[PDB]
Design an enzyme around this catalytic site. Structure first.
Site, PDB file in Angstrom:
ATOM      1  N   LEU A   1       0.802  -1.239   0.000  1.00 53.15           N
ATOM      2  CA  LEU A   1       0.000   0.000   0.000  1.00 53.15           C
ATOM      3  C   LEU A   1       0.838   1.294   0.000  1.00 53.15           C
ATOM      4  O   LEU A   1       0.414   2.309  -0.554  1.00 53.15           O
ATOM      5  CB  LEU A   1      -0.986   0.016   1.178  1.00 53.15           C
TER       6      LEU A   1
ATOM      7  N   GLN B   1       5.242   2.981   0.636  1.00 56.19           N
ATOM      8  CA  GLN B   1       6.688   2.753   0.756  1.00 56.19           C
ATOM      9  C   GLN B   1       7.358   3.916   1.485  1.00 56.19           C
ATOM     10  O   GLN B   1       6.733   4.954   1.718  1.00 56.19           O
ATOM     11  CB  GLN B   1       7.337   2.543  -0.619  1.00 56.19           C
ATOM     12  N   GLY B   2       8.625   3.737   1.850  1.00 52.30           N
ATOM     13  CA  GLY B   2       9.328   4.722   2.656  1.00 52.30           C
ATOM     14  C   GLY B   2      10.763   4.333   2.955  1.00 52.30           C
ATOM     15  O   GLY B   2      11.507   5.096   3.577  1.00 52.30           O
TER      16      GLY B   2
ATOM     17  N   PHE C   1      12.683   3.815   5.489  1.00 55.90           N
ATOM     18  CA  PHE C   1      12.024   3.468   6.751  1.00 55.90           C
ATOM     19  C   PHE C   1      11.397   2.064   6.719  1.00 55.90           C
ATOM     20  O   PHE C   1      11.676   1.226   7.583  1.00 55.90           O
ATOM     21  CB  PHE C   1      10.964   4.521   7.111  1.00 55.90           C
ATOM     22  N   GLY C   2      10.550   1.818   5.720  1.00 57.59           N
ATOM     23  CA  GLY C   2       9.886   0.538   5.566  1.00 57.59           C
ATOM     24  C   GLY C   2       8.681   0.594   4.638  1.00 57.59           C
ATOM     25  O   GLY C   2       8.583   1.484   3.793  1.00 57.59           O
ATOM     26  N   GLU C   3       7.758  -0.351   4.807  1.00 51.88           N
ATOM     27  CA  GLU C   3       6.607  -0.483   3.925  1.00 51.88           C
ATOM     28  C   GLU C   3       5.307  -0.707   4.699  1.00 51.88           C
ATOM     29  O   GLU C   3       5.314  -1.002   5.896  1.00 51.88           O
ATOM     30  CB  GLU C   3       6.816  -1.658   2.961  1.00 51.88           C
ATOM     31  N   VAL C   4       4.189  -0.564   3.997  1.00 47.92           N
ATOM     32  CA  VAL C   4       2.896  -0.915   4.539  1.00 47.92           C
ATOM     33  C   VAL C   4       2.210  -1.798   3.536  1.00 47.92           C
ATOM     34  O   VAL C   4       2.207  -1.478   2.357  1.00 47.92           O
ATOM     35  CB  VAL C   4       2.008   0.321   4.749  1.00 47.92           C
TER      36      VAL C   4
ATOM     37  N   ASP D   1       1.402  14.457  15.708  1.00 47.26           N
ATOM     38  CA  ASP D   1       1.429  14.507  14.236  1.00 47.26           C
ATOM     39  C   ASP D   1       0.033  14.360  13.694  1.00 47.26           C
ATOM     40  O   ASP D   1      -0.182  13.695  12.687  1.00 47.26           O
ATOM     41  CB  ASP D   1       2.342  13.420  13.676  1.00 47.26           C
TER      42      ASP D   1
END
Ligand code: VSP
Length: 261
Positions: free
Chosen positions: A17, A19-20, A21-24, A129
């Site tokens: 879903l 991307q980035g 650090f990591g993923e979702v 945030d």
């Protein structure tokens, strides 16, 4: 390992879903439960840092907060949470379904968010945030708070927080006021055509965003209350929740739908 650990084999990552650090990812847990999964790319962030998001969600449990389900807490790390089928509130407002949202739906979403934040307020936590990119939408326009920045983006941050590092529930209130403008503009970036430094400077000089087109003055007034210079003068989330839940009877009982709101 606490009661939250699950076996790596119990978790299937199906669709990516984000991307980035990591993923979702969207995936399945125990072959039966639809879930959202956040990964940490090994050696890009402290495991202790990445997991902090999960420590908070073990203690905070509420129908308007995206729920923690499970963790795999050794590298490679996975955090498993409630799947929110409609994606970010921000993408939602901007997209094809945003087009048709009118003030009653948008205020009800705000009241839901305010309900999650009232819970956070009662628990003595701080989000840090709060903004539409950190709210998730589910079936039947349910909205839930996600992505705690911590526990206890200058355009969304109260001036005392951005300048002096004074983050409190009252700086979340300020962010909520900004979130209200995202809701009533269908997700436009706040302070249009200003850069961060101009925002900070102008907000200090008493500048505040004007009433958006077709937004009642009574709702913009509420934004203005969230944006009081003195943090302690800003309303509580318990107050915002009640005000927004009762809005169409107590505050604008004469509301008539317009072209966009
Ligand atoms: C346990 C909730 S959390 O906020 O602390 N951690 C967490 C873990 C996985 C996913 C999310 C947020 C998220 N993001 N997206 C897309 C990328 C917009 C989602 N889609 C569906 N469902 C969820 N939970 C989504 C937060």
């Amino acid at each position: 390992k606490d009661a939250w650990e699950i076996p790596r084999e119990s978790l299937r990552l199906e669709v990516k879903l984000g991307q980035g650090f990591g993923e979702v990812w969207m995936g399945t847990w125990n072959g039966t439960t639809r879930v959202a999964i956040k990964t940490l790319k090994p050696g890009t962030m402290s495991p202790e840092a990445f997991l902090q998001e999960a420590q908070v969600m073990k203690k905070l449990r509420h129908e308007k907060l995206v729920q923690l389900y499970a963790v795999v807490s050794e590298e490679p790390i996975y955090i498993v949470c409630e799947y929110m089928s409609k994606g970010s509130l921000l993408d939602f407002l901007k997209g094809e379904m945003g087009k048709y949202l009118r003030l009653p739906q948008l205020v009800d979403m705000a009241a839901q968010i305010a309900s999650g934040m009232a819970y956070v307020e009662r628990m003595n936590y701080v989000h840090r945030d709060l903004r539409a990119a950190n709210i998730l939408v589910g079936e039947n326009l349910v909205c839930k708070v996600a992505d705690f920045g911590l526990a206890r983006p200058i355009k969304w941050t109260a001036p005392e927080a951005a300048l002096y590092g004074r983050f409190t529930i009252k700086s979340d209130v300020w962010s909520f006021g900004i979130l209200l403008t995202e809701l009533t503009t269908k997700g436009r970036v706040p302070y249009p055509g200003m850069v961060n430094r101009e925002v900070l400077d102008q907000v200090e000089r008493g500048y505040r965003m004007p009433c958006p087109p077709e937004c009642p003055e009574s709702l913009h007034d509420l934004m203005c209350q969230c944006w009081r210079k003195d943090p302690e003068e800003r309303p509580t989330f318990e107050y915002l929740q009640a005000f927004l839940e009762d809005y169409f009877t107590s505050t604008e009982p004469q509301y008539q739908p317009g072209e966009n709101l």
